[PDB]
Design a protein around this ligand. Structure first.
Ligand SMILES: Nc1ncnc2c1ncn2[C@@H]1O[C@H](COP(=O)(O)OP(=O)(O)NP(=O)(O)O)[C@@H](O)[C@H]1O
Length: 261
């Protein structure tokens, strides 16, 4: 079907391009292939993809272009997505949420350490392997924010509104890492409550104003235990310079609470 690989079933559908299960005729290995038909975007995407080597990031195996279709071969995540484990209005058990958050932080420290920002962290982009290990997927908006040890500020507005940090809507230029931290906090909220707190983090949004006025007797907050809520209070801080960094998340009390066998 494509060189030595047989394309056997549809795993999902993207904006521009489906993902299929592909099985090697000789070795029997099953991978995923993203099929894509704005052509410079994939060259950048491929270039970032070749950099990735971590247990909580989807691995890139290579690509082949046939005609105008690019085939991106990658690690298969056969457990579906984190979005499927979140029950609406409920979330998931706190131990399971803590485990996924620890894995998410591991993958995000990894990306940041190679100078890559993901820019669209959300449950649909966090896939699971067959042992429910989390894999950060989808590098279509990813970009370099540090190169030769020099940081560059971002200016492009991108991502998904309910997950996006407020500076991205307010500031001409902004630091990459606190944006990804913020999206992880919205992810953690979703996992603990089964609901997103706001349409977008703007002063025109009542639910966002209500959080900034600390009305945590409202939903989703009132569904979340005090210990993880204290962490969310340090993550979902409007001023990105005052927002908690990953090294400090790792010192948080709930982060370090024993919960799971
Ligand atoms: N490596 C993988 N293993 C298993 N399923 C995958 C894999 N990659 C993607 N998928 C599924 O295919 C879907 C669409 O692929 P992808 O194009 O990467 O996401 P998307 O929804 O299109 N976002 P974008 O590419 O930004 O439009 C994903 O949401 C997953 O459900």
């Amino acid at each position: 079907f494509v060189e030595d690989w047989d394309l056997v079933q549809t795993l999902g559908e993207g904006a521009y391009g489906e993902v299929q299960l592909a099985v090697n005729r000789v070795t029997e290995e099953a991978v995923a292939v993203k099929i894509v038909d704005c052509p410079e975007n994939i060259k950048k995407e491929i270039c970032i993809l070749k950099m990735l080597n971590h247990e909580n990031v989807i691995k890139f195996y290579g690509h082949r272009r046939e005609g105008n279709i690019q085939y991106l071969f990658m690690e298969l995540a056969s457990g579906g997505s984190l979005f499927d484990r979140i029950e609406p209005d409920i979330g998931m058990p706190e131990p399971d949420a803590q485990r996924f958050f620890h894995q998410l932080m591991a993958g995000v420290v990894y990306l940041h350490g190679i100078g890559i920002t993901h820019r669209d962290i959300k449950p649909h982009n966090l896939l699971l392997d067959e042992r429910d290990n989390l894999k950060i997927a989808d590098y279509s908006l990813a970009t370099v924010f540090r190169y030769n040890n020099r940081e560059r500020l971002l200016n492009k507005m991108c991502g998904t509104l309910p997950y996006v940090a407020p500076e991205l809507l307010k500031r001409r230029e902004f630091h990459a890492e606190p944006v990804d931290v913020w999206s992880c906090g919205i992810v953690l909220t979703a996992m603990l409550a089964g609901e997103l707190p706001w349409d977008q983090p703007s002063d025109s949004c009542q639910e966002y104003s209500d959080w900034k006025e600390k009305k945590t007797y409202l939903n989703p907050w009132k569904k979340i235990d005090s210990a993880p809520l204290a962490l969310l209070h340090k993550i979902l801080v409007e001023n990105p310079s005052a927002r908690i960094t990953i090294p400090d998340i790792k010192k948080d009390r709930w982060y370090n609470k024993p919960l799971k066998k």
